[PDB]
Design a protein around this ligand. Sequence first.
Ligand code: NI
Ligand code: NI
Ligand code: NI
Ligand code: NI
Ligand code: NI
Ligand code: NI
Ligand code: NI
Ligand code: NI
Ligand code: NI
Ligand code: NI
Ligand code: NI
Lengths: 144, 98
Amino acid sequence: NERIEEIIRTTGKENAKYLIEKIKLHDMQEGKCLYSLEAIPLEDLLNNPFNYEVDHIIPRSVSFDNSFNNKVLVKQEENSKKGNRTPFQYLSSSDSKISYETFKKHILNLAKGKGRISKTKKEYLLEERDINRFSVQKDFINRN
Amino acid sequence: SVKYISNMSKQEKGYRVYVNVVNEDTDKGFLFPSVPKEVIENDKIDELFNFEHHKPYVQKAKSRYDKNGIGYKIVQLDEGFQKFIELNKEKMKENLDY
Ligand code: NI
Ligand code: NI
Ligand code: NI
Ligand code: NI
Ligand code: NI
Ligand code: NI
Ligand code: NI
Ligand code: NI
Ligand code: NI
Ligand code: NI
Ligand code: NI
C-alpha cells in the first residue's frame, strides 16, 4: 500500500485514475509478467500502459470470476498468445516463453512464501484440468 | 498432415508431452499431461494417442516449425521422443524439465 501510494503521488492523480488496476497487479506481481517472467519496469507501464493488459487467468466463460483473484497483468503479446487457454495449457504449448515448471515454482513461492497472491488466484494459475471438458466446467459452476 | 513434438517435461512417473498436428492451414495442439516412462524411453510413438490428452487447441498454422518459444528444437513425431530429449536435454535442465 505504501509503495502504491508513493507511485500515485509521483505519477499524479490523473494518470493514477486510469492505471490504478494495472499498478496494483504490477505491485502484486513484484513487477513481473506472470506468463513470461520478464520484468515490467514501472516507468514503461506508466508511459506505455497499452503494452500491458489485464488477462483473466481462467476465461470468464468458464470461471464467472471478474474479481482480482482471476486477474493478472501480462505483456500484450502474452495475452494474445494465451487465447482462451489456462496458463497450464498455454505454457505446455510451443507458444510460451517459459516452462510450466518454472512458472509453477514461481507461483508457489509467490503464494506460500511471499503471500503476494490469494489462495484462489494460485489455484487458478495452477489449474491443470481441461477447462473445455463438461465435467471440469461443471465443477467450476458448482464451486459457487 | 505433419505431427511435431513441440514440448516435453520429465515428471516423477512419466513425461508431459505436447504435439502439434499441422496440415495446410491449421495447427492442432494436443496436451498429454502424463505419458508413461516406458512409452517415452522406447520411442513407442504409435502408443502416444492411446493416453489421455486435453482437447486440441486449434489455431492458424505457423509459418515455421523450428524451435518452440522456450528454445527447444521441434522434432517430428516419427523421429521419436528420444530424439527430442537428445537435442534438448541441456536446455530442459535449465527450465526444470529434465
Ligand atoms: Ni490503461
Ligand atoms: Ni482497482
Ligand atoms: Ni517510475
Ligand atoms: Ni470464451
Ligand atoms: Ni463474469
Ligand atoms: Ni489476489
Ligand atoms: Ni496458497
Ligand atoms: Ni467425465
Ligand atoms: Ni509425422
Ligand atoms: Ni482422451
Ligand atoms: Ni524459430
